[PDB]
Structure 1
Amino acid sequence: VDPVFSIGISSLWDELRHMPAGGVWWFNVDRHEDAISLANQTIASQAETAHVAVISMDSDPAKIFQLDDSQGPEKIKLFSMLNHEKGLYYLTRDLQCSIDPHNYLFILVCANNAWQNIPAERLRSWLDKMNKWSRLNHCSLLVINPGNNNDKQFSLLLEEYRSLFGLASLRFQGDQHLLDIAFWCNEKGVSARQQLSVQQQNGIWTLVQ
């Protein structure tokens, strides 16, 4: 009954696009502009009846996140937080105060190297609590992290594959970008360790086959 959402990359398979609400998916990107472009394309790629929110840091979200005039939901509930760990710690309560989070999609676009200061243990606890809250309130959380050297953090995320429902990364390679899908769990099955190439044509992420 709960609707499933899609990721913002065109010409991509439904096995790696659909995110059934009620879990946590994680994304890494090499550059901040890539993060914002992916977030905007995800917002523009949602169904009209879907309920989507965006949380941003170190900026005014009304000026950096856009909406297409032809596709997507009628409106989105932008949010904003301090560039601090306490914002992520309180995210659940803060969103519960202002919104009923049942059947929602939450895009969390952090700042450059924002997740660098969060210790491993508190990141594990955050992922566990977010997974439990997502299962309890039937909401989905997408995390987009523009970073450079999160190899220790990426190994940490891999160790926590129970908390997450999907981990993917986006790396810059000059003219194209490499998508590394560590795993994905959706309605149509489970994937494991693909590598795919995606390009940016007119600001739209299109898969090159």
Structure 2
Amino acid sequence: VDPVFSIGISSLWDELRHMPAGGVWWFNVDRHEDAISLANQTIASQAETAHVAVISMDSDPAKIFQLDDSQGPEKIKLFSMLNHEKGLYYLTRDLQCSIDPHNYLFILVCANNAWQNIPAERLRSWLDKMNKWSRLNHCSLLVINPGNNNDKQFSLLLEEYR
């Protein structure tokens, strides 16, 4: 019943492209401009009835996130958070106070090296809470992290494959 969302990559097989509602998918990019372009393409590639929203850091999302005039949803919600760990920690409660997450998509475009100050154990706990919240609310979450030294973070993400 819950619709599946699509990633913004042209000529990509649906096996690596389709995303069911109620899970978490992680994306890392070499450059922040690549993150912005991917986020804009994902926004433009979603369905009209899809509920998609974007959360950014250290900027005003109203001036850096756009939609295609010919394709994409009619409207999306723009959210701004402080460049701090507490913002990421409270994200769930803030969005619950703001948006009903059922059949609704998260796109978290973080700043450059934003996930460098997060400790390993707290990151694991946060990921577990996000996954449980996604399953409970049947909501899908996408995180785009522009970073260069996330090899240890990549290994940690691999270890939490469940």
TM bracket, shorter-chain basis: over 0.9
| CA positional deviation for 1:156 | 0.2
Instruction: Measure, in 2, the Cα distance between the counterparts of 1:93 and 1:102.
Output: 14
Instruction: Say yes or no: does 1:76 pair with 2:76.
Output: yes
| CA positional deviation for 1:52 | 0.3
| CA positional deviation for 1:105 | 0.6
Instruction: Measure, in 2, the Cα distance between the counterparts of 1:6 and 1:56.
Output: 20
Q: Deviations along 1:36-82, whole A, 9 cap, x unmatched?
A: 00000000000000000100000000000011000000000010000
Instruction: Measure, in 1, the Cα distance between the counterparts of 2:69 and 2:136.
Output: 34
Instruction: Measure, in 1, the Cα distance between the counterparts of 2:42 and 2:126.
Output: 24
Instruction: Measure, in 2, the Cα distance between the counterparts of 1:95 and 1:49.
Output: 19
Instruction: Measure, in 1, the Cα distance between the counterparts of 2:75 and 2:145.
Output: 24
Instruction: Measure, in 1, the Cα distance between the counterparts of 2:137 and 2:104.
Output: 9
Among all aligned residue pairs of Structure 1 and Structure 2, give the percentage whose two residues are the same amino acid.
Answer: 99
> Which has more helix, going by share of residues?
2
- What SS does the corresponding residue of 2:86 show, helix, strand or coil? helix
> Which has more strand, going by share of residues?
1
Q: Deviations along 1:144-166, whole A, 9 cap, x unmatched?
A: 000001000000000000xxxxx
TM-score, structure 2 as length reference: 0.99
Instruction: Measure, in 2, the Cα distance between the counterparts of 1:84 and 1:43.
Output: 25
| Number of equivalenced pairs | 162
| CA positional deviation for 1:100 | 0.7
Instruction: Measure, in 2, the Cα distance between the counterparts of 1:32 and 1:100.
Output: 29
| CA positional deviation for 1:20 | 0.2
* Structure 1 residue ranges, 4+ long, deviating more than 4 angstroms after superposition: none
| CA positional deviation for 1:130 | 0.3
Listed as ranges, the gaps of 5+ residues in structure 2 are none
Question: What RMSD in Å do the two structures reach over aligned CA positions?
Answer: 2.4
- What SS does the corresponding residue of 1:34 show, helix, strand or coil? helix
**Which structure has the larger Rg over C-alpha atoms?**
1
Listed as ranges, the gaps of 5+ residues in structure 1 are 162-208
